[model samples]
Structure formats: structure tokens, C-alpha cells
Target: TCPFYKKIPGTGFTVDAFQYGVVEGCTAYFLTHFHSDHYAGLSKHFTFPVYCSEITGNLLKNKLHVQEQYIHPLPLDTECIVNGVKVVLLDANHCPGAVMILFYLPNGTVILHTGDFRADPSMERSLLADQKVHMLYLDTTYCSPEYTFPSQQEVIRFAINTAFEAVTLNPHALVVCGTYSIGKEKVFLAIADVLGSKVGMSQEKYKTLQCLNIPEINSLITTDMCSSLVHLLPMMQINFKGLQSHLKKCGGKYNQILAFRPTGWTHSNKFTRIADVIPQTKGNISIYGIPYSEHSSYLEMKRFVQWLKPQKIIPTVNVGTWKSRSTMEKYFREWKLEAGY
Candidate 1:
């Protein structure tokens, strides 16, 4: 979902799962993880094999309904020979089965694709220590120093505490937490465990969570909304003014609705900056923006690149217009100088 899959010219390596501009005679295609944008234009009618983690493969089969034969499940921290490339999957710590991929090219160079993950210390110690990474395709979502938010565990705690407070403030209000379909299971599960309630989901989300193999999350799933006090609504539902519309109508006999949006885009004032760990409220609807992002912030991004010291840094977000490219350039220069890479 980060960028269109691109071939490294005559290098014979394809990036991500983008199916566009089909690289005729390319040796292989690699998938970082199962986020739809990474596999844009992909569906059950696909005609190729995809290399991914076991959890991602299960998601492909059960959630996306793809055939098992087309899915190649790579065990974590283990190397496997794929064609001439030597590939290894390391734990990304972003989601249940997310991985940061390392490729040992036939030319004796190492390439790393940090598939939508925050800085993971374990991965650094176990997989990246003393490694020479030649090329790095990075996630630069918050590639500015303005984005310095708390860790995910801290944000999860804040969300849970705020949920209890919001409920206490309005006894009859419905408390909804926003998340993507898969990655935010910890946030939802922790809230459910704290509230002593089940998580309510639509059919698709229920199936997606099943692949995680967490009995607590699986046990908490329910179809009926009223069956659970806290509903794990999709973040897409909460954004784009959908959260406002849903609360306006969904809050039937309930007195109010409170929503929590955990993200790094909390710094406010500037359209680009979402204020760090603040709640913006209007009428009976309230959404708190917590710093629980999957991608690295500017400081973390600089630190990571400095440690790995990749030769060429490729911005994952492909630029279209001059204005957007300028933004990319500004951050790229700033981050590169800071990282000394």
C-alpha cells in the first residue's frame, strides 16, 4: 500500500506487490506483508505466487480467499532459496504476522525493506546487528522532527484509560475505538480485557482476526453491536467524517458517543501536523488522537538509517506533482544529513 511496485531497472529485483507496469522477464516478485496497498490491484483471480509470512499467507487464504498453493509462507528469521535470491523474514512487530524482509542478492549485496513497522529493538539485535544493508526502501510517513510521539504501549494504555473516563462521563454513551481491520488487535484486545466486554465486528474483520490465533480476541468477537459495550470500528469508518455521521445516527437511546483514534498525527494547527496526544471534540462526538503509529517517526527513521547505513535511500511514497516532490526532497535532505547516511 506504500507505493507502486517498481523494478530496479536492469537489477532484476521487483519491489512490493504492485502489479503495474509488468516487468516482463523479471525473475521474481516479493511481498513485504499483506496490507492491500502493498498488493494493489491484487485479488483472488491472481495468476502468480506470492512470498509472505505464514500469518500473511493464512490471511491470503482465509481473509482474502486466495488459494493456498499461490501463497508461499516463509518462517520467521529463517532463510530460504527463492530462485537465485536468498530471502529472510524478520519480525516487524507491527502486527501479528508482519515482517521486515532482508534479501541477499546474487551480486552479494543485502537489501532491506522495512514493511510498515516501527523501530523494533529485538530485530535490531537479532537480525540487523553488524549487517551491511546496501539498499533501504523505507516507510517515511512521518519524516519530520515534528513527529515525536510516545510508544504504542503507552498509547494503548492512554486509550484504555480514556475509554473508561469517557464512559464514566456519559453513562449511557457508546464508546467506539477506531482501528484498521488487522494491525490494531492489541489496542482492541486490551480495551476489551479492561472493560470486561467482548469486541463487536462485521463479518470480514471477524475472519481477519481469526488468523491471529489469539483466543482472547477470538472469544471477544460478536456480530451484534449491542452485544458488546466497546465496538472496534474501522479507522476508515472513523475518518473522512464517517465517525461524525455514524455517531449522529448510531447513538440511539445512548446519550453520547466517544471515539478514540490512535495515531502519530496528533500535532495540530498546521494541516500537516496533528497535535500530539490531544482530543478534539464537537457536540456528543469526541475523538482522541493518540500516538500509536506503525511507521517510524523522523527521529526514529534517522536513527535506524544511521545504524543500518544503507547506500541508497529510496522514499517509498512515489511522488506525482512538483509540490509533493519538494516535500519529499526537504525531508529526505534533512533526514539524510541527520542520519549521516
Candidate 2:
């Protein structure tokens, strides 16, 4: 069973804990982004006050039909008072509307909750650099040394080039991009932009994209499936069997399927080159599992921890059991001691 560590230790606030039901003392609920795993238990029935970024607020209202009165969309990079505590929202660099929350308690304690972040370099320049944070709630999605991978820029370029070359060889090939509700958008959009092709998506997905308010994405979206060579679908739809059925349903509109399944789990130090990550291929279907993760890598997390040097470290992922939690704790202790904190 997963541990219920979503509630902040010293406060009545909980971040992304809806799946656990009503937290006894939680005075406010904070959502970091629009991803399903983060907002799993949230629905129209949720009555508690919700705090999030503007885009995430829009999504909760439009997609989940949550009441507007209960949603509080905090502006980025600005400090605001919430029930006598100072709070600030910083971009998490994971997905659109994702934010890393900063809390300054009345007793002068500084707490940072990274709802799900990529730990980008620019974060070092934020107000976090000035604060002596007492507690840090980190996203440990890729906290293991085995998860080392290249930056998003490198992966995006690789995806664009790979798709470009594949389609160049077969002009009639349809490029199917697998995506989650909010993440991996940049990768697919980059591939579409580089190929100068429109992206076809379901009406539901198109509505969710509209919530993001990305200007460039508007003109590139097409409802007419046959008009765009690039099609965006859920991640599960890019498999060989799924693609075969999808292609057959298109009624000869495309010759073959060249698809991308973007995720961070596919990369490791064992591979000499990024392109060396294996791809699954069948007679006419190809799925490239690209290492395009939005979470911080092992090294990135290490650097971030060393920089903050928080007095206490709390992991937000992979802490379901004693073994897993201790494993992550070992890394935390090592990094903290190495940094002389």
C-alpha cells in the first residue's frame, strides 16, 4: 500500500492527495498539474478549497467540472497570503500549469513542495536560492542512478530528426504520436512542427489542449483525420497491434505507421547513444520509445538536493513500502552528507 505522505507535516495543507479521500486535518488541497495520477480522486464531488496554477484551475473546471468558486488559481512568481501563511508558485518545468509550491509558515519555517518537476537549471535563480528551506518535499520518480538520461532538448531534437527521416523515406507514412493527458506535448508538437504537418487528435484531447492556451498549438490542430499526416493518440494506441488496427481502419489513407512512445523509463547508462534505445518493429508498424521524461533525473535530483540543503527531505514518489522508502532515504542521506549539510 502507498504511504499517505501527501499531507504536509506541520500544516493543514495537502498536495495531490485526493486519492486518499478526505484528509482529517487538511484545510486546503493543492494540485500541481492536470495529470491523472496527481489528480486521481478529484471530481465534481470534491468540496474542499483547491489551490493551483491558472491553467490547472481551468482544466479542473472544464475537464472535471469542478466548481469555480472552490478553485483558487495562484499567479506564478508572486507571493500571496493564504490563511495567514505566505505561499508562492513557481513553474515546475514538467507540464503546462505544473508548479512547485513554496510555503512560509508563521514561525519562519520555509517548506518547498515540488509537485512534479524536471529540476531545470533556471530554478537555481529563483527565490529558493535565498531561503534556508527547513523542509523539502521532492518528486522521486527517477531517483535511482539507473535513470540517467539526456535533456529534453536533446530528446526533442532526436525525435524530430528521427520522424523526419522516416517520413522522408516514405512520404505516405503516418506519424502517430503517443501522449498522456498533459505531458509529452512538446515532443509531439516539435515533431509536427519540424515536419510541417498538422496534428489530428480526438475532440476530448483537443479540448484539454485548449485549456493549456499554447498559441502555436491552435493552428497546428486539425479535426479532419485525413488532412494531417501526424496523429496524436493515447499512449496505449501506439503499440503494434493497436497501430495495425488503427491503420486498417483508416481505409488506405496511409501506407505505414511510424510512431513514437515517449517516456523516461526507456533510457539508461547501458546505452551508448540515445538512438540506440531499441524500437519495436513489425511488418509495417514502428514504435520508437524515446527517453523524453519531464521528471528530474537521478543526477538532477542530487544536484537539486545539494543546492537546497534542506534540513529534512521527504520523497513524494516510490515510498509505498519500507524497502522503497529506505532505498530513497539512503540516497537523500548520502547527498546531504556529501553536500556537508
Candidate 3:
């Protein structure tokens, strides 16, 4: 569940809190990314100054039709001032335009808010590595030992290989990759590049990607169903009934359907390895639930907290209930102790 309140304590700025109505003291609004859950309350009626990465700003303008004057696009890794506070944006590695906001308060306190992220080795070498973060607003989406999954590269390689094998066995098979509006582009993009297949999606989705301003994606996207064997569809449409209807709409262009439902939720501690996780099949349609999550895993979170060793840690996710929040804090305590901080 998302937080009931979006205000960052001790500041006049609110981070992703447009739905709660105009916060009393909020002078500026900061958006981490364009994900619906994060930007839920934001709309054209909003009047506050919005700060985000340039890509997110473009998405806000193009998708939400928000006024240009209210949207403030900040460059990543550059220091800027907002309401007497020093700020910097670092790539979150979760989605396009997603950023981990670093705030330098007037009192010399440094705070890092990871909007939503997938921790990678490259992060340790970022500008955040040099700062002494006093407060960490973490993305604890998968904040338990049970949610351990492999790195994104491993999962992406597995997805590409699995899709290639299935298509090789049946040359006429249609590949359906399930995704959200912004995330999971890497998976389907890799699959298409390897198989030499174009991607098919709704014109609206294509427009959304265009807002990202990625040069390579333009060549791979096509609205025509028959033009591409690889189709990107919403997660809900990956089911049996949904695929059946989609296949019917294709008018016998492909014989079999191979769909990849890529998400972190499919992972279980019971599986010793990523490949050991099985796939579900019904007749000619097979659905592979790959553990390709944009959020950090349990171990990844631990490593990040240990490395940062902030004076205080506040979870941005799984904090709605006392039990869930306390459990995450317990892990935070354990990790801080292990880091000897």
C-alpha cells in the first residue's frame, strides 16, 4: 500500500502527494517518475511547481497534459536549489526518468529518497556514494528474506533465451510480453532485438514511449498487429481468456502463443534458481512468469542500507500497517548493526 501522507517531514516540499489535495505548507512538488501509483493525485488542475527529471516532465506534459509552467524539469547529477534546499537527481534504474532524489537541507542534513529502484553495481559509483546521507527514504517494496530474486540482467537473459527457444521450436509462434505503461521495456526490447522481430502495441502506448525520447525504440514499434510477432500488452491481458481474445483478433497470423509475465511477485524462496521456476501452459498457449522486477530485492535493499548507513531509515513502501513497517525496521536495525554503523 502507498503512504497515507506524501509530505517529507521537515520540508515544505511534498514528494508524489498530489492526491491528498494541496498540502498546507507545500511550496513545491517533486515527482520521482510517471508511474500511476506515484503520480496518482496529480492532474491538470494542480497549481504547485513540480520538479522531476526531464523525461518525467515530458511524460507529465504529453500524457497528463499538465501545464508547462508548473512542470520544472531538472537535469540528473546536477546540483540545483529549490526553496533554499540543495537538490540533485540520480538515475533510479527502475524505469525511464525515475530518479533517486538527494536533498541537502539548510541545516546540513542530507536525505536520499529512492522513489523506486532496482539496485545495480553502477549505483555504488554514483554521486550518492560520496555523500553522508543522514536520512534514507527507501523503496522497501520487497523488504523480506523470502523475496530474493536474481539480478535483472540474469532475468532478462533468461527471458530472451526462453523466448528464442520457444520461437525456434515453432517459427510461427507469437510472443506476448506483459508490461506496465512505463516499466519492463528492457525485457521486450531485448527479445525483439535478439529474434529480429518488431514490437506491436496500442498507439497510445507508442506515444508514451515517444515521450521518453529514446532513439532506438522508434524503429521497433508498429501499431499494425500483423506487422510484428512480438506484442506488448498490459499485465491483465496476459491471462488465458485475454490471450484467446487477442489471438482471435489476430486472424490466424500466428498458430501458437508464448507469453512472458515478467514481475518480481512470481519469485518464491522455494525455487533454488531462477530457471527452476516453472511455466504454466494451457493447450498451445504457454505463460512464463519470470522474476524480472524493477524494485530492489531483499538482499539488494540490505546492501544499499548498509552502504549508505544513514542516521535514520524510513521506508517508502510496505509501511501502511504497523506489523509490516516494524518488520522492515527490524531488518533495518539488523543491517545497520552488521554494517557497524
Candidate 4:
């Protein structure tokens, strides 16, 4: 929840506002990032002005395909008070456009909400925040053991090295790499910069990634530019019966083809296998088991919990539980809401 609030008694004013400068008297809203999850609530049906980082604004306009009238992007560490509440935007490691919120009350108590963070090394910029956050709202989307990913550098290397090796080993190899156009767009950009590479994504996705403004990234070539490569859309699977045609189109046709998967299944022996989508493609398909998690790990989570020492500690339930939901109010000296998912 945002730390600031407007003085309206109660008129059903949403946390965020609608477009055309509809001030629900709730005053204002602070958007952590340009992701649709946060913006859709305010922009899908109508337009609403939200405070965010300049990069985040372009993310909506550049990467997210949002119009200019929909956002109010702020500087990186700008602090503004709206309706007696202070909200600040910090760096988030999850996506290039993502931003963490440092929301706090006038009393000095603060809440640090991580926006889909991955605990990557670059996230340390948040430590330099001006306010002392009293609580934290973390993104633990993959807190459970069910979700395991590789490090950013490791995954980056794998992306470039693996794709290059696949092609080098056999130029005719059918190489199909899967990535969420917006999420892993940077990864593919790295591959292109390092390996003279071309990626296969839809027209919409191609234009979307082109909007990335980070220094190292530029753009990518769609699948149609290459020969015999099969670039499938998200959630699209190859038909085993139609293998020959698909392979021919993908440039795999009896050659060593590499298929990269975003999600996979782990085995007891630590040997994980990707989902069954690659069965249709023939000839030696290699599954790149690179970890790509987007949140702090159990170890980091523990440290964060220990450092803040909130009156009532809330476990994110990602790797562990925090007080079993904190229902036992009597046992606690203070109160807190669950920050992690």
C-alpha cells in the first residue's frame, strides 16, 4: 500500500486515479513501474496521472505501448508529499523499468516495497534512500522452491554463449529461444550486441523492445530475417505430427537445434527438464538450465527481516513463513502486514 493518503472521508477514491486528470479527491498515486499490473488499474478503462521515474514513463510509452497522456514520470529519487504522505521511487532489479517505492508516514515510519526485485547486484542503489523505512513490502513471486533461476551474469553468458555455440556447432541447427518480450528483452539485446545475433519475436514484440533506453541495449531482428529458424510465440507449442514442416521452417530439419525455455520442471537429481513444448523439434535439443529469479533469495530475505526488525515481523512465505500470518495479535508487541508474496 502507498504510504501517503488524501483527507477525503470516504468516497471510494481508488489508490490510483483515472485519465483526463480525474482527481478522485484521494489526491494522487505513486506507480512503482510502468508494468501493466500497476498501470492497468488506472489506465485500462481510463487515463490517470501517476508519479514515476522518467525511464519508467518511457517504459509505458516506449516499451509498454502506453500513450503520453497516461503518466506523470518523476526523477529517480525525487520525494514528494501528496495528501500528507511521502512517496519516493527507488531502483528495482526485476525489470529495467521497474521501480521500488519508499512510502512513509510523516511520523518517520517508512515502508520499503520492492517491485518485482531479483536481488541483483544493481539493486543496492536502494540502500542510499533518504528515509528510514520502518516496514518492507517485497515481491516474493518465486519465494517457494518451485521457482529457481540463475544469476544475471550467468544467464547472460548462457544466452550469448549457448546460442552462439548452437549455431557454430551446426549452422543448420534449429534454434528457438523463448523469452517474454518485455521481461527478457534486455537479455536478447545483449546476445545481439555480443554475437552479431538476430532474435525471432512478433512484430509487436520487436517494436516493444526497441524502446529500451538502457545504454548497452539496442534492438533485435525478428525470426523472419533468418533462414530455417522456428521462433514460436509465447505459449505456442510445436505439433509432433507436423514436425518436418516446422523443422524446415525453423532451419532445424535433422540438424542440431537449440530450444531455450523460460519455464521448466526440476528433477530430484538436480537435472531439470524443460516443459514438453520442444518435443516437436527434431535433432539434439539442448535445454539451457540457467537460473533467472527476480527476487531476493531466502538468505537475503532473512537478512532483510533481521535488519528492519519491525515490531511485528511478517514473513513473505516465499522461502519461509512470517509468524504464520500474524493472526495472534496478543502475542505480538506490534503489528505489521505481510510484505512478501
Candidate 5:
């Protein structure tokens, strides 16, 4: 029986948002990532102590203007105590500083919350030596059997090659890549390294990457448009109307805007699965949606579940509509049956 806040009783932790007022007096707060959807309602006004990776803490300070006093940096592969619980942070492998939180309860219950990760077998192998995961808060972003596609490295190659090919077709055209705020810097770095061309980044994105301080990433940051052939923009930043307006600014020096979106949705449907390249046009821009994602695929999920062998899996997100509900539930049942749990 708790005294304050709407607690998850056995877990003794509140999560994600603070404004909901549900976590007002929980044992502690846990923030897995800085994605808006994941960290919704997090603001500069937040005062509760939060546990997250170092990179995520930095992002919180810079992005949300959150003060340092309330932030606790949870480095990967280290054990830390929160109240009476033994907790460890594992690499989520989804985005910069994303983590899978492992909680060891006094009652011998081990819970794992995978914060939007691309399943890494080696990481799992390393961590599984001592920890027996009992319950898993899984990232079922691409849980359905129909959601199958090439590996992330394959997709990155395809995206980079596609961008290069588009440039070859129209030498004067500028290639724009769609990426999440902190998710796809690898894609940008690959283009810069392979083609010996820097990709332009907005002033803010440059700083965000700079703060990360990874040598491979900090090695290059493109700012000028005319000097560079490709521009790396946020996924939501590229739309036809905005492109048309920006094109007007270019004064026709650039022949076209070749936009690429490396997303899982590209292959989520039947028609998109068979297509080598799916192209869409609006106004003067040609948008290409690449079949790429950082989340675990259906096959990958099976492997992850098998390795973790959780007694129960609570899907973190991936619920949108009734149809998705059925698909997700069916997959959950299938996995449980196969796991014999």
C-alpha cells in the first residue's frame, strides 16, 4: 500500500511523462529515451529525479531545457540502486543513448523494459549470464509477420546508393534524407564518408550531434547548401509544399529535390513489399520511401524473445487501431506457444 501517487505497486516506478501527475510520489521516475512520443509531457519545469542514459540526460538538458539537479545519468552495463531495487542499464541499440532498463525486485522478479531497441544478440548474450528476465516490456514497433524487410545495414546501403544514383541521374539536383532527430546519424555519416561529400545539417542538429562527441560522427558536419550535394533534414521537415517554397528560394539552380525516407512503413503493406523503389511526387519534389528501420523485425523479435525467454511480454507501444490490436495479439500468442510458456 503506497502513500502517494498512482504507482504500479509491485514495480514501485512511474514512467515517461511528469505532467500526467500520476508519478508525483512514486519511488523514482525512469525515462528511457528523449523521443517526444516516449518522453511526452517532459518539460523544463520537471523536478522529479529521473534515471536515463548520459546521452539522454544531455538531450534533456539541451532539448527540453531541463535542469541538471533532477537528472541522473545511468551509464550502460552498470548496476545502480533506486530505492530498494537493483537496476541496470543495457544498450537499447535503437537511438543514441537509448537503454533497456533491468529491474531486480526483492521478490526475485526481474523485469526488463526495452526502450525502442533494435535487438542486439551479443548484448543479450552478455547480459543473460546472471540475469533471468521474468517479464519484458518489449518494443513491438514492427511485431506483425507481414512486417519483413532487409537488415538495417542493407537498407542504409540501399538508401545511400539510392541517393547517389539519384544524384547521378540529375547532377544539379540536391538529395534530402529524412531522419529522426537523433536516430539516423549513421546514414548521414555513411554518405559523407563513402561519397566524400558532407551532408548539410541545420544549426541545431549540428550542435546535437556535436554534443554526442562520437569521433566518427563529429568528424563531419555539413552546414552550407551550395557546397554540399545532400542535406540531412528531420523526417517531418520534408513535405512537398515546403520543398516547393524552398525550391523557389533556390532560384532553379537545383533541378530537383530527391527526398528519401528510411522507414519501416515502406514495406508494411503488400504493394510496398514488391517494389524495389517507391516514389511519390508532390509539386516539384520527388520523394522516395526506403524500406528501412532500426526496430526489430518479426524474425528478430522471435530471436529476442527466445533469448530473453520472458515469462510474459507487455508490448510497450505499437497499438494504433483495432486491426493492429488483432495482429499484435496474434503474434503475442504465436510467440508464447513457440516459447512454450
Candidate 6:
């Protein structure tokens, strides 16, 4: 609940880095992602100066198909001070470029505005800043007592070993694990290292792989790393039906295929959708539920709220749903928290 969903139309209160909160006399705005909810009024209005990540700008150009005026792309873990407002972009882990913003007011108030998160311990550094935080814009999406997940190391090791064991069983196959443009880079690397085979990639794929500086596994590369295999393939390449058809027509019936799309598991109440898709493909397509979510876990949420200690913990960005509030408040109480209001 980065931004309060229901608010006055013209206010500048927005989610994470985006500004939609209308502080009458103030002027300027910023954005964190390419999604419509955060950037709903972008480009159409030229009144405010917007700062965002460079990747977000590129994504807007291609994925969301938009161009904006006076948009500044800032680097990660960096801050841009505007007037008396100090805005810092921290890790949100919601999307590829999504950032949970840390807002500092001139009055010495600090707000940890988390859009969503995972308890990777990778984010622990993000919670601490120059001064102690007085309030938090919590992401309570999975904050119920019932919510749980395996440790990051556990998940990572499982993904690597599991994918590796499958590929090793049939060494002649190419595994295609699906990950989003905004996330899933690490999973691919895990599989690559365990299998010890460089991912065969097209030109575009080389760029992502090059950034990681991983060597493909091969007979020539006795010590070469498959850790970079997934990156070697085009970032957008998924073994989706469309791409599969194209590959088939080219007389390139792969010996084997490993396809992954974990997020799709939530769409179906039952595990059938995931189960059915993975095995049905001609090549080896497998479904996995690493429980890889971007939202903060029950433990993380508690730590976040304790850090901020806001007076009014308003769970917002309703998105026209009551479940959102229930989802949040339940966690708040379970975590020994009281409503901000």
C-alpha cells in the first residue's frame, strides 16, 4: 500500500517514489515504476518535474508505450533532494526497477515507504539510514500470521539444485526458465552454475550475461561457469507458446526445454494450471513454486513498523478492495501492532 488508493484527484500523494500527495503549495513529482497505478497521469501533464530510474524510462518507452517530459532517471540506492524534501530510492523488489522510497521531511520525520518486499536480508541495509525512521508506509500484502516462506538461501539453493538435477539427467537439453524483465535474474544464474553449462544466447541475451560477466559452460571451459547461462539468452526470451512455435518452424526442435513461470501459480486457486503447463510441452517444461514473492513477509513487516512507529498506520492503495485492508490490519495486530488511525 505505497499510495493511498482513494484520495483527492489533484493531490500529489503517490506510491513509493511517485508523487500524488497534493501538498497545495508544493511543486514536483517522481515515479518508481511503469505501472498505470503509480504513473496514471504521466506525460499528459507537464506541470511537475518527474524523476525515476533509467530502466523505468526505457520500460515506459517499450512496455507501457509512453514518453514523458522532464523525467530524470536516477541511479539505485541514490537520493535526490528537492527543496526541503529528501527522497531516496531503496529496494522494493516488486518489479525489476521498482523501489521502495524513503521519504525525509524537513521537520525531521522519516518514512519507510515500502511498495512490497521479500525477507532476503538483502533489504536489511535499506531499513537503516542517516536518522532513525519515525514512520513507515508498510507493504502488508503477506503480513498474516499464516504467511511464511523458506529462507532466501534455502530457496536459492533449491532452485539451483533442482534445475541442475533435471538438466543433468538429460545433458543434451536446453533449459528455458521464465523470469520477468523486472525480476528473476538470480534464479537463472543459480541454474546455470549448478548445471555448469553456459546458456546459449542470442545477441540481446549477451548484454544481460555480459553485465554479470559469467562464462558459459563448455568442454573448452573446464572451469567456465554456467552461472551466467540464463543471462546469456535474450532477457525477453520465454518458452511461451509463440516462441516455441517459431523455434519449431526453424527446424530447431530442441532436445529438451526447461521453462519456468512461478508467478503464474497464484492465478489459479489450485496448482493445476502450473502442473498442467509444465509437463505438457514437447520439451521439458516444469512448474515450480519457490514462493518467490515481492511483498514483505510477516517478520519483515513487524520489523518495518517497529522502525517507523507511525502515529496513524493507514493501510492504503485500496485498489477498490476490502481484502487489502483485512490483509494488512490482520498482520498489524498479529505482529502486536495497532492501527495508525
Q: Tell me how many clashing residue pairs each candidate has.
A: 11, 0, 1, 19, 0, 19
lDDT of each: 0.71, 0.86, 0.86, 0.51, 0.74, 0.53
TM-score-best of 3 and 4? 3
Per-candidate Cα RMSD to the true structure, in Å, reads 3.7, 1.7, 1.8, 6.5, 3.3, 6.6
Error of 4 at 196 (Å): 2.3
User: Candidate 5, residues 1-341: lDDT per residue as tens digits?
Assistant: 32222233476696554556554357578888778876877789887788898998888898888899998887778888888788888888887888888888888888888878888677756565586888777788878777677766777777677667777777887777777667776776776666667777788888787667477654477667667767777688678876676667767678788887766665344554423666789655898777666788788887889777788777766565778767787877887788786
User: Which candidate order results from sorting by lDDT in descending order?
Assistant: 2, 3, 5, 1, 6, 4
The lDDT, on a scale of 0 to 1, for candidate 4 is 0.51
Worst 10 residues of 1 by lDDT: 1-10
> Lowest-lDDT window of 10 residues in candidate 4?
3-12
Tens digits of per-residue lDDT, candidate 1, 168-280, equal: 77777777778774676677778777777788877787777778767555577787777777777878777537866665665565656677676546555244332244667
**Which residues of candidate 1, in runs, are more than 4 Å off?**
1-5, 8-12, 169-171, 236-253, 269-278, 321-341
Residues 1-341, candidate 3: write the lDDT tens digits: 32434566678887887777767777999999999988997888777899999999999898998999999999999999998888999999888999999988877888888999987768889898887989888898999998888878888888888889988989889999997769788888899988998899998888898888787877888888788989999889999999989899989888899999886766364566877766788988889888778998888878877877889887878887999988988888888777789
lDDT of 6 by residue, 193-219 (tens): 677655544444333233322344232
Candidate 4, residues 18-122, lDDT tens digits: the string is 332555354455566555545554533344455677766766665545567766776666776655666666677666667776656655666665656655544
Q: CA shift at 163, candidate 5, in angstroms? A: 2.4
Q: What TM-score does model 5 achieve against the real structure?
A: 0.88
TM-score of 6: 0.67
Give the range where candidate 3 is weakest over 10 consecutive residues by summed lDDT: 1-10
Give all TM-scores, in the order shown: 0.84, 0.96, 0.96, 0.69, 0.88, 0.67
Error at 157, model 3, angstroms: 1.4
Candidate 3 lDDT score relative to the true structure: 0.86
In candidate 4, residue 143 scores what lDDT? 41
